[PDB]
Design a protein around this ligand. Structure first.
Ligand code: MG
Ligand code: MG
Length: 255
């Protein structure tokens, strides 16, 4: 699950011949492929995009099709370098404080909407729902915010179901050149065996290379959020949470 090198976080069209060779090495290790010569693709990225899938299969009978499809997924992420997932609590306990949550997500979304950022809105209570599938399209983001404002909080606090939806997206569309951060807004008041499920799911987030941040609403349980987020420093209240994250994002945006 090693991330793509920084040189290779750029669009393939800007890749150098050295980059293409480095890309082939990374894949060999990432996908346990039959090793190939560094001179299998003796060209730059622009040239690589002109090859057909047949050309990939001819140059690498054992890995060509897989390499071609790996490249298609990279091209699909386009300029995305940072995937941001909002896991929002919509349990009964926040029915009278949802606008605060919405405003928080709204401010961050309007702040960093750009070609390099893709957004996903997830809400959770007794069930979890994807309000906005991961997208950097500003129109879809604007519609997703409208849907988010219309949410009526009801139900229990099953945050592990919310974290899963993000993990799922990260597994399918969220690797390669994109860094994934998950922002979970909740009071962290869990019942029964939910605390274990939530920490287990959060560990799967970190195993996918995702950094988990916990923004606490209401009288939030500090201890619980510290076990969900990566660290105590990644757990901060809503007040001043906009300023905090703005920086974390801006720093990651530096690539
Ligand atoms: Mg709750
Ligand atoms: Mg609050």
């Amino acid at each position: 699950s090693i991330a793509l090198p920084a040189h290779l976080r750029l669009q393939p069209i800007y890749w150098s011949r050295d980059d293409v060779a480095q890309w082939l090495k990374w894949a060999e290790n990432e996908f346990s492929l039959r090793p190939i010569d560094s001179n299998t693709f003796e060209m730059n990225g622009k040239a690589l995009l002109l090859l057909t899938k047949e050309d990939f299969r001819y140059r690498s009978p054992h890995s060509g099709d897989e390499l071609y499809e790996l490249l298609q997924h990279i091209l699909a992420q386009a300029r995305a370098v940072f995937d941001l997932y909002f896991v929002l609590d919509k349990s009964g306990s926040v029915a009278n404080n949802w606008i605060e949550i919405y405003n928080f997500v709204q401010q961050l979304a309007e702040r960093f909407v750009s070609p390099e950022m893709r957004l996903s809105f997830i809400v959770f209570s007794s069930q979890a729902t994807i309000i906005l599938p991961l997208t950097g399209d500003r129109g879809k983001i604007s519609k997703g915010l409208e849907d988010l404002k219309r949410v009526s909080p009801v139900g229990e606090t099953y945050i592990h179901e919310g974290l899963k939806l993000a993990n799922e997206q990260i597994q399918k569309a969220g690797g390669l050149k994109t860094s994934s951060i998950i922002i979970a807004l909740t009071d962290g008041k869990l019942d029964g065996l939910v605390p274990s499920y939530a920490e287990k799911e959060a560990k799967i987030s970190r195993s996918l290379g995702a950094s988990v941040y916990a923004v606490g609403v209401l009288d939030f349980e500090q201890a619980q959020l510290e076990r969900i987020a990566d660290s105590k420093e990644q757990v901060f209240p809503v007040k001043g949470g906009f300023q905090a994250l703005k920086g974390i994002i801006n720093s990651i945006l530096a690539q």
